Each structure stands twice: as C-alpha cells, then as structure tokens.
Amino acid sequence: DLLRNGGIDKTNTKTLYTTMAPVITAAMQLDITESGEALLRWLDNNHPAGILTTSEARKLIIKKGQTAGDKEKLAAWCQALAQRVLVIRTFTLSNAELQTLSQGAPAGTITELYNISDFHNLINRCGEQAGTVLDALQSGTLTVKILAQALNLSEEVITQALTLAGQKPELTTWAQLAVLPPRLDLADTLHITP
Amino acid sequence: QALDSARSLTGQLMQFGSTLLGLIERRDAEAMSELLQNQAGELMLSSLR
Amino acid sequence: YRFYDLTAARCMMAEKAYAWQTNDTATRYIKSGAWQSNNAGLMAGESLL
Amino acid sequence: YRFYDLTAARCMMAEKAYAWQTNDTATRYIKSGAWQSNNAGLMAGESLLLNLAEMEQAWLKRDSRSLEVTRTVSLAAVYRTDNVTLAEGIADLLKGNGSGNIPTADNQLHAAFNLKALNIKDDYPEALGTTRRIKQISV
Amino acid sequence: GRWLPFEGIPVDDDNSLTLSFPDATGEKQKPLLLSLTDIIIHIRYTIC
Amino acid sequence: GSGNIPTADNQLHAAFNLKALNIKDDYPEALGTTRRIKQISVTLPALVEPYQDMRAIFRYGGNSLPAGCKAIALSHGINDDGLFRLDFNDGRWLPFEGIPVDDDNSLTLSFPDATGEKQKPLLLSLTDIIIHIRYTIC
Numbered sequence: 001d002l003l004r005n006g007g008i009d010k011t012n013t014k015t016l017y018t019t020m021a022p023v024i025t026a027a028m029q030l031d032i033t034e035s036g037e038a039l040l041r042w043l044d045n046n047h048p049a050g051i052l053t054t055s056e057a058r059k060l061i062i063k064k065g066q067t068a069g070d071k072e073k074l075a076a077w078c079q080a081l082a083q084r085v086l087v088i089r090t091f092t093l094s095n096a097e098l099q100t101l102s103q104g105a106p107a108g109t110i111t112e113l114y115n116i117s118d119f120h121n122l123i124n125r126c127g128e129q130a131g132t133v134l135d136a137l138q139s140g141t142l143t144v145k146i147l148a149q150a151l152n153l154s155e156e157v158i159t160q161a162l163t164l165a166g167q168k169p170e171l172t173t174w175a176q177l178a179v180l181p182p183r184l185d186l187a188d189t190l191h192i193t194p
Numbered sequence: 195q196a197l198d199s200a201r202s203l204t205g206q207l208m209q210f211g212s213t214l215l216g217l218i219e220r221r222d223a224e225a226m227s228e229l230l231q232n233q234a235g236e237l238m239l240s241s242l243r
Numbered sequence: 244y245r246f247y248d249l250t251a252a253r254c255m256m257a258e259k260a261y262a263w264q265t266n267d268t269a270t271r272y273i274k275s276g277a278w279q280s281n282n283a284g285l286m287a288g289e290s291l292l
Numbered sequence: 293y294r295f296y297d298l299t300a301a302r303c304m305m306a307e308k309a310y311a312w313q314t315n316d317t318a319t320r321y322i323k324s325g326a327w328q329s330n331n332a333g334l335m336a337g338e339s340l341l342l343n344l345a346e347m348e349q350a351w352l353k354r355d356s357r358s359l360e361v362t363r364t365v366s367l368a369a370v371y372r373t374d375n376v377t378l379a380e381g382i383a384d385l386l387k388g389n390g391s392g393n394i395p396t397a398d399n400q401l402h403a404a405f406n407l408k409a410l411n412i413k414d415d416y417p418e419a420l421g422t423t424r425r426i427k428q429i430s431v
Numbered sequence: 432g433r434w435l436p437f438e439g440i441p442v443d444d445d446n447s448l449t450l451s452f453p454d455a456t457g458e459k460q461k462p463l464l465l466s467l468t469d470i471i472i473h474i475r476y477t478i479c
Numbered sequence: 480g481s482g483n484i485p486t487a488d489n490q491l492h493a494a495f496n497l498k499a500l501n502i503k504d505d506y507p508e509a510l511g512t513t514r515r516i517k518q519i520s521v522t523l524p525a526l527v528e529p530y531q532d533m534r535a536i537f538r539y540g541g542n543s544l545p546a547g548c549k550a551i552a553l554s555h556g557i558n559d560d561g562l563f564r565l566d567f568n569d570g571r572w573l574p575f576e577g578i579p580v581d582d583d584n585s586l587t588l589s590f591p592d593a594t595g596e597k598q599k600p601l602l603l604s605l606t607d608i609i610i611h612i613r614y615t616i617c
Contacts, residue, residue, distance in 0.1 A: 005325035006339075007245040022244070033283055195570035196260040199352065200253035201292065203345060207250045208288035210338060215285055246342045249349045256352060263545075263577050266513060312439050357547030357574055359478040359536075360563060362554045366530040368469040383465050388456065394449075401452035401464060412442040412476070415534050416591060417490075420550060421478040426440035428475040428563070431450070471530045475563055478552070 003061050016054055017041055027078075028085045035088075035095045042102040043084050052077040087113070091120050096134045100174050118178035125181070126150045142171045153184075161187070161194040247278055247287050254291050296327055296336050303340050310347055314354050315423060321347035359420060360427065363412065370405060442476055484587075485540075491590035491602060494540070502580040502614070511616040516578035518565075518613040521588070523556030526604035533601060537561065538587035539575055548574050558611070580614055 002023050003009070009019040017037045025036030044054050050073075052060060057077050060070055087107055088098060097120060105119075106112045126133045129150040136142040144162075148155045161183040162168045167176050187194045254273040262268045277290040303322040311317045326339040371377040385396045395404035412424060440446070450470065454460055481487050485494035502514060521537060535553040542549065551561030551574040561574055578584070588608065592598055 001325050002328075005323045019244070034280070196253075196257040200250070200257040203250045203253045203348075204288050204292040206341065206345065207246060208292065210246060211285050211288050213335075213338070214283075218283075246345055249345045252349055253352070263572075266515070266577075266579075312434075315439075315441075355571075356479075356545050357571060359547065359550055359552045360561065361476060361478065361534075361552045362532060362563075363474045363476070364530050364532045365472045365474060366469055367472065378470065379468055382467065385455075395447040396455050399454060399456055401455035403450040403470065404447035406444065407442050407446055407448070408444040410442070412474075416478060416536065416552075417589075420536065424442045424476050424478050426437050426442065426474060426476045428435045429437045430473040430475070431470070469530075479547070 008062065009058050011058075013055075016058060020054065020058070024081070028081065030085065030088075032095055035098055038095070038099045038102040039081070039084055039088070042098070042105065043080055045102065045104045046106050046108075047080060048108060050076070051080045087116070091117060093120050094123075094130070096131055097123050100134050100137060105174065115175065115178040118181045119174050121181040122151075122177050137171070137174060137177070140172065144171065147171065157184075157187070157193055164194060244284060247284055250288070250291055251277065293333060296333055299337070299340055300326065303344060306344065307347060310351060314351065315425070316354070319350070321350065359416075361416065363410075363415065365410065367403070367405070370409070485585040486593050489592060489594055491593035493588040493608065494585035496582065497580050497584055497586070498582040500580070502612075506616060514580045514614050514616050516575050516580065516612060516614045518560065518567075518573045519551070519575045520558055520560050520611040520613070521553055521556070522558055522609040522611065523553070523605055524607065524609070525556060525601050527556070527601055528597065531597065531601075534591045534598070536587070536589040536591070538589060539578065540585040540587060541578075541583040543583075544575070544577065545572060548572055548576060551575065556605075 003020065007019065009016055017040050021036035021040060022033045024040065025033050028036070028039070030036050030039065040054050043051075047053075052073060057074065060066075060074055063070075066074075084107070093101070093116075101107075101116070101119070105116060107116060123130045123134070126147075127150075133142065133147060133150050136146055144155050144158050148158050151158070158180070159168060161180055162171075162176070164183055165179060167179075171177070183194050251273075258271065258273045261272070273291070278284045278287045300322075307320065307322045310321070322340070322343045326343070327333045327336045368378050371381060382401075385401070387396060388399070389396060390398040392398060394402040452460075452464060455464055480489070484492040519537070521535075523533065523535070525533075527533065532554055533556055535556070537551045537553060539549040553559060553561060567573070590598075590602060593602055
C-alpha cells in the first residue's frame, strides 16, 4: 500500500532505486536508505530465476487490479529481498562493502557465500582504511601500493599472494580480493612469504 | 509573490527536515537501546551458566 | 524526497519571475547542491532559503 | 484520530476546488495511505501536506493569464430567431395558466436558452484556447 | 475567496437559461413586464 | 483567404513593429536605458449598434511572455483593457507586461468575422484605432 500510493516511482533507472528504497529499508529495518538503494541493485544484478527485476516489481505494484497471480510473484520478490538482507546481516557487512558487492556479487550457493566471507574478511582487515580500498575498487585505480598501505603489509607480499591463481597487475574486481585472505592466512601460519 | 510562495514551501521543507532528523536519530536510539538489551540477555546467560 | 522536488521547482519559478521582472538573466541565485545524498537531503531547506 | 478526519476532508475539499478551478478531474493528488494504523496515524500530516504541495505546484504551473471576454446577448435577437420576438411574445401572454417544467408557466414568467444555441465558440478562433468557462453574469 | 455565481460553467451546453419572474400576473409587476422591451445580458467568460 | 497575415482568411488583422513606433526617441536616454511595456489599452471609436459587443483579439507576435500574457481580448472599444477589473496589485502579470519596446512584435489586432454581417458596418465605420501603451522607464 505504501508503494502503491504516494509518488509513482519514476520509470527512469537510478531513480527507481532511490524512490523505492526508503520504504523498502523501513520494511527491512536496514541501517541506511542508501544501503536500501544498494540492496535492490544487488538483488537486481543476480537473483534466483523467476524473481522479478525491480522494474517488473514496480510495473507489478502499480497495476489496475493485482490478480490472484502476480501477487505471490511479488511475495517471492520480497522474500528474496529478505533473504538478501539476511545474507547482509549474517556477515554484518558495512554499507561500503554492500555497495561494492551490489554490482554483481553472486550469492545463493555455498561456493559463493565462501567468497563473500573472504572478501568481507579482507575488508575488515583493511579496517579504518577500507573506505579508500572500496572507493579505489569502485573506480579503476585500486593499486597494490594503496592496498598494502591499507593492510599494513608490504607490496612484496601482496604481489606474491596475487600470483597464486595469478591476476597480478589489474586489481579490478572484488573477486580478486577474496583470493587474498586464504593465501595470507597460510603464509602467516607458516612463517613464509606466499 | 512567487518569492513568498516559494519561501512558504521552503519553510515547510525545513519543518520536514527537522522532523526527519529527529526521527532518524530517535530510531537509532531505539535500535541501540534494543541492542543493549539483547546483549544483556546473552550475557546473563553466561552469568547464570 | 518528493517534497524537495516541489520546493526546488518553486525556487526556480521564483528565480524566473525575478529574471522577468528585472531584465537580469545572466545572474542566477537558486543554485544546485541544495540536496546532498550524503545527508539524505537534510538541510536542503536551509540552502534553498 | 478524530482530527485527521477533518484534515483529510479539508484536503479533499481543496482537491475538489482544484478540479473545479482547473477542468482536470482525471488527475488526483490527495491520495490514501496518509494514515497508517501501524504507526497510530503518526506522520499523517506529513503525507497530507506533501500531497497539498504537489497539488499547489501543479496549480502554479497550470496557472497563467487568461483571455476574458464579455458577450452582450440582446435576447430580442435570439427571440427573432424564433420569429416570436419578445416585444409581442410577452404582452400576449395574459392568462392564469398553470404548468410546471417550463422549458406565465404557473404564476410566474420564465425564459430558457441553451448556450449551445448561443454559438459562443464561434465568437473567437479555436487557436486561442480550447476551453471556455463562464466567470460572471450580469443582466 | 468564494466563487461568483455561474462560475466555471463551460459555454458548450447543458443549461436552459432560467430567468424567472415571480408573480407575472395582474399587479404592479404586470405593467413592468409588459413595458420590458428587451432582456440584455452580459456573460463574462474566460478563454484559457 | 490567406494565412501568415503580416480579411486575411475570414478576419481582419493589423500588425505593427514597435521598432517603427520610435518609442526610445520619445524620451532622452539619460533618463533610463531600458523601457518595457506595462499595460496596453485600446480605443475603437466606431458607430456601434446598441447592446452589441465587438470581438477583437490583440496579440503579441514574439514569444517571450508567460502563457497567456501574449494575448488579450476586447469588448466594446473605449479604453477597455482585455480585463474586467484593472488592478495592478494582483500578483499575476498584466497582459503584454515586460515587453521591451525595441522590436520583435507584429502588433496583432485581430477582428474575427470581418465579412458581411452586423460587424461589417462597425468595421467600416471605425475611422481610427487608438491605442494607449503604458510602459516603464527604469
């Protein structure tokens, strides 16, 4: 009802999220309306089959008479939303981690919840400087120098930890960062370099 | 007169902004007050234990 | 959020009525940045006013 | 609770006055859901006033100057169109006849004229404006 | 703030222009109504 | 019948460029550099039949005004603005307000149905069109 009445969520993209997200967050009790904006983007980018894109969800909430069908479809969409909020809440990933994962972090099997947890681990290691790491990752300028300065390790450990399943020079995606924590923990539990 | 009409709406927008900041900080107060209680519960568990 | 949309339009109407009542269109007073998404648009009314 | 009842009625009055001052009845601005029982109706005023501001700004965009015209209608002319013109159509009416549904009906006189027969749209070109509404009538 | 009488009426149709005259019978009003040579009306309308 | 007037098609139409009206030459330049229209009243001293209006549209050629400020109507032809009440205190602009007196207007004074009818004797008996342009020198 709160989405049906009120201002008609605008058809143009990047505004559908911003106009649907405050009330979506209120219904999911997220922290920030901006985390709500990013959660819809995340569930849009990768979702179980048959679940509605946010555009379809808007076109389906704004309907003359919502049929018996295409209402359980919307219930399934909101259940997927709640499941994604659960993925966010069981890892306690911050708004910036959330916004990084929003642009296509596959979630829904254990092989992928693993990499989500590994990325989350590396970001918590970055710590007070994770804002810069995730920003330079959102742009195309995440370099090993700033990553090492943020992790408080040397470049000559991280450029080596990259070489195992090598993507050394182009740190472009968050998937490349979830490779670090296992290699770093191994090279820490054996006092050797990767 | 257009200026007065816009000044009235801007006053109303300021009222919305004040009330919204109030509600935001108040919701964050309730969320913290509930977090503290959940913690006190899972802490009295270990105390009894 | 959807009230700031009306308020900015009113301020723009007022700026246009200003430009038509005084033939000074090169100057402009209602400037952007009144709404900042960092602050969820808080204190947009202050800037606009 | 029983004050929100007056406020919603006022917002509806304002929407109706908007629809009558601008012939746009398909559109509607005061929408439901302003009162939510989850919140004991809190922040009903915010929603209603956002709607009122939406409607006011729609009005401020649709408002402008308007061409306004007087039309002096000498009814003797439109009676001459009936060849039964007033000058001799009034004096001959001398009887105590009673008849309701007039268009000396029962005990009173009554004129009746269809503004479609007054050809007001033909007074001015259509490129000026598509709508024409009465403002005031003097006799 | 109140509207004027017969305001907002579109000039298209849907009105028998009622101009009633109570007690058009034999009285002081009869000479008046007989001497009324014409009814002249001034309709102010608006073209938006 | 002929569109693009400046009895065009079935109506009469006058057109006059305010640049040809030499308004800046009426007053010295040391008074003010800008001059803008404020209000326009028209006078049509014609042989009119009793209890008869006169359909006449007075319109702005250019397009720099609000929506309806560019056009005005007329009723009888003596010092009659297109309005009913003439009040400056109204927040709305007056018709043809803010127009600079320099150029960019064929002064449209239309006359619908200038053909043979009750209007033809009026328009023939109209010996002159007299207009009163109120402007402002800031």
